Symmetry: D3
Subunit: 119 residues, 6 copies
């Protein structure tokens, strides 16, 4: 019933920008903190950014701090990731996830969207 659906991924040149979206339904969106999780090739999933239910607080992992911006529009029930100054190391499948005693199990994540950074 809880559904998270991502879009906005694709190919991008190094230094370029991209915005990911995640549409949520089946729960009161504003009641949950939400995160973006990065899954690079051959690597474990890594939470790179988090935002509170109200949008009043955000957190960034060092690997994306200063380049990525997490935001949400609670009126549109949508979560965003603005990815700027993209580098090859940003190449990964990105998922959105609800908070839980850190993130929910991956069965409940978005379907994932691949971001490929290439010249």
């Amino acid at each position: 019933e809880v559904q998270l659906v991502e879009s906005g991924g694709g190919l991008v040149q190094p230094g370029g920008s991209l915005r990911l979206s995640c549409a949520a339904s089946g729960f009161t969106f504003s009641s949950y903190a939400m995160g973006w999780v990065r899954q690079a090739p051959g690597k474990g999933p890594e939470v790179v950014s988090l935002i509170s239910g109200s949008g009043g607080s955000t957190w960034y992992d060092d690997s994306v701090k200063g380049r990525f911006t997490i935001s949400r529009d609670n009126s549109k029930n949508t979560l965003y990731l603005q990815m700027n100054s993209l580098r090859a190391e940003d190449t990964a499948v990105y998922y959105c996830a609800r908070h839980a005693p850190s993130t929910e199990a991956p069965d409940y994540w978005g379907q994932g969207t691949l971001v490929t950074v290439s010249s």
Copy 2:
């Protein structure tokens, strides 16, 4: 201006019940955890209950646990305190307050509502 308006207090007999209400305006209500603060005669204020922005989490001080229930209705901008099994020691002015990093300054609580428990 942020405004919090308490009501619902009054006179009750020991063992009686009351339901306090707090109407909020001037901010997005659901974005703030809220608490009820007790000020008994000649005593410092004490937070006796707390509820998260979403209403998903609640906390009760020991002195009140099992007797009081905090709840909120975000569509109505209201916070409630159901007080059962009242005793003379519950006699106090009750305030609602926004969580700050903990509770906001007393300047931002209500004018309060007086509960007098007496025979």
Copy 3:
């Protein structure tokens, strides 16, 4: 050495009620927050409710809020879930789990108890 043992599951009609118990040993029970985790057929585990060590605070996922009550009796070293107004979607194996940087690994959960909601 840490042991969590559940009981109280079984068959129930839609709209009916059931209470799950979880007996804990091998650690100071009151020193740990405890949760109930739902595992519906073909679905990932989901923490649906949580309670602090003292019992002073509780949390509920939206899917169970208003119908389920988590509680604990620290004098009996036992954790409970009161499940009311059961619906078909509540059909699942329920586990108890200690908090950790959200819940402990599932190796440390209770053995699970199946709840089957059927007419």
Copy 4:
């Protein structure tokens, strides 16, 4: 002695911008989350923004969200508040303060810096 020195305030027109600074000494700066506290004329203090020790997490009060940006430079021992789109209601003395379990006592804030927004 722990010392916090605010500056950067002054006179600005509505819609203008200011950047406040706070220089810290007497403690390991990066070990403490820091906040900015607003004291408007005749009002109690209000924490309007908060940043973690590492600068990795930030929080904004509703009244300030989308207009102010808190940041820190741990190598310089400085905390900043970028204030955009100022309005007359932002007129206040601004203090920086260390997180305590929430905010430290007012004795440990600065002497503050006055922001006057007027035509």
Copy 5:
């Protein structure tokens, strides 16, 4: 009534040691995180250490780290502060206090215990 009784303070030479105690009554001791609060002459109160309900987590302010050790005995209803390598700057009234959402109002601390560090 909730009551907290501090003792163990007194006169010591620089480099000396003291062990403060705080006896609690009127509440379930293990249900509350507790802190030690320093009030030096002419200074605002400062929480210098904090311990969780279970005693499982502890925090120390920088000014005290590596010299003081906070501990508790829940079966005896006692909180302790071991103070080593005392210096003249540790001269203060020491209070124990319950965590509130952060610290409880000063009305609920002890009458305190005076530590005088002098030659």
Copy 6:
């Protein structure tokens, strides 16, 4: 890029002592809380101790409380576990891990170091 490298494990007699180290690189060490995770034969991983980025707060699981000490030297970018009064049940592979919404995925842990407690 983030790397955690452990050392200091090996054989030890019951009652003996051992210190584990974990060298970190590829991130600002002081910006992350760090933990030690125990993986005994045939058992799930278990976080036994945690320390904040500054070193100001620590947590211990009951199974190690009073015997193990977690510490960090942020100037050496190194995390330690001092293991005292070792018992057979302490036999396990120990990993260091960064905090995340509890610990990061095990792909990002140290390589592990085996501690064997035998007469």
